[PDB]
Design a protein around this ligand. Structure first.
Ligand SMILES: [Ca+2]
Lengths: 223, 58
C-alpha cells in the first residue's frame, strides 16, 4: 500500500496473509473455513496466516493454517486478468475472535463514489521498494467505470472496478494482491492489478466481488 | 546472449510479491527481483541456475 497508513492493531480482522515461504499475497476470511483471494495468487501449496499485524514478528494472536483446497474461478484469464478470483478452503476451521473475524460478501454492487478500505503488506513505495512489517491501510473510493476505462483503454471488463485516485499518490502495490477492498462492511473488491503503483491516471484495478457472490456460495457448499 | 537477457526485470501489472531471478548484464550474474504474478517477460526465471544457463552467455 503506497501513501497509506499503519492500520490500528487488528482493526482489519478479516485480512489474512498467504505464505509459501515468505508473504506473497493477501486474502479475506469469509467464513471459518474459507478465504477469498486473487486467482493470480495461486500456488500449489499455501499457508494462510490469520490474526497478523507484524508479519515478521510472532506476536501471540496468529493462527497458521494450511490450504486444503485451492479453487480458482473456472473462467480466469491469466493475461486479461478477467475473473481474477480464487477460493481457499482451510485444512481446519479457524477460531473466531476480535483479531480473527469474517467479512461479509456484497449484498449488491456498490456504486461509484462509495468509500472503501484497502489493506495489505505490499510495497509502500511507487519508486523503489519497502516491504512493511505492519499491515497498511488506505481509504479510497470506487471510481466511475468511465474513468477506469479512460485510464486503461480497452482493458477493463465488467468484472473489474478501479478504486483509488486519478491523481495517483495512493494505491495498492506488489504484495497486496488478493487482499480486501471493504466498503460499508462488505467485501466489494480484491486487489488485482494496475500499471505501476500510485501513478497518475492509473489507479489500481480490482476484481468486482459483487459479480461472484453466487459462484462463491455455490463453490463453498459443494466443497 | 539472447536479447531478452539485456532487458531490465519486469514486475508486470499484477500485485503479488513473487521472487524470481533475472540476468543483470552489468553485474554479469543473475539476481532476484519482485515479479507481480502475471504477463512475465523472458528475463524471469524460477531459479538462478536456469537463469545463468539461459542468459550467462559464454
Ligand atoms: Ca505476527
Amino acid at each position: 500500500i503506497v501513501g497509506g497508513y499503519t492500520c490500528q492493531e487488528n482493526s482489519v480482522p478479516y485480512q489474512v496473509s498467504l505464505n509459501s515461504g515468505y508473504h506473497f499475497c493477501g486474502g479475506s476470511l469469509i467464513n471459518d473455513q474459507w478465504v477469498v483471494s486473487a486467482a493470480h495468487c495461486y500456488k500449489s501449496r499455501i499457508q494462510v496466516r490469520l490474526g497478523e499485524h507484524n508479519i515478521n514478528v510472532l506476536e501471540g494472536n496468529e493462527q497458521f493454517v494450511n490450504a486444503a483446497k485451492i479453487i480458482k474461478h473456472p473462467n480466469f484469464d491469466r493475461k486479461t486478468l478477467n475473473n481474477d478470483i480464487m477460493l481457499i478452503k482451510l485444512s481446519s476451521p479457524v477460531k473466531l475472535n476480535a483479531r480473527v473475524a469474517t467479512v461479509a460478501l456484497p449484498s449488491s454492487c456498490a456504486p461509484a463514489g462509495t468509500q472503501c478500505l484497502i489493506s495489505g503488506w505490499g510495497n509502500t513505495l511507487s519508486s523503489g521498494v519497502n516491504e512493511p512489517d505492519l499491515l497498511q491501510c488506505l481509504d479510497a473510493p470506487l471510481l466511475p467505470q468511465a474513468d477506469c476505462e479512460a485510464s486503461y483503454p480497452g482493458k477493463i471488463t465488467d468484472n473489474m472496478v478501479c478504486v483509488g485516485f486519478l491523481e495517483g499518490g495512493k494505491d495498492s502495490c506488489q504484495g497486496d494482491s488478493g487482499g480486501p477492498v471493504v466498503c460499508n462492511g462488505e467485501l466489494q473488491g480484491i486487489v488485482s492489478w494496475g500499471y505501476g503503483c500510485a501513478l497518475p491516471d492509473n489507479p489500481g484495478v480490482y476484481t468486482k466481488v459483487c459479480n461472484y457472490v453466487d459462484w462463491i456460495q455455490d463453490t463453498i457448499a459443494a466443497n | 546472449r539472447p536479447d531478452f537477457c539485456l532487458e531490465p526485470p519486469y514486475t508486470g501489472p499484477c500485485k503479488a510479491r513473487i521472487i524470481r531471478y533475472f540476468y543483470n548484464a552489468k553485474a554479469g550474474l543473475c539476481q532476484t527481483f519482485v515479479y507481480g504474478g502475471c504477463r512475465a517477460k523472458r528475463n524471469n526465471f524460477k531459479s538462478a541456475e536456469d537463469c545463468m544457463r539461459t542468459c550467462g552467455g559464454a
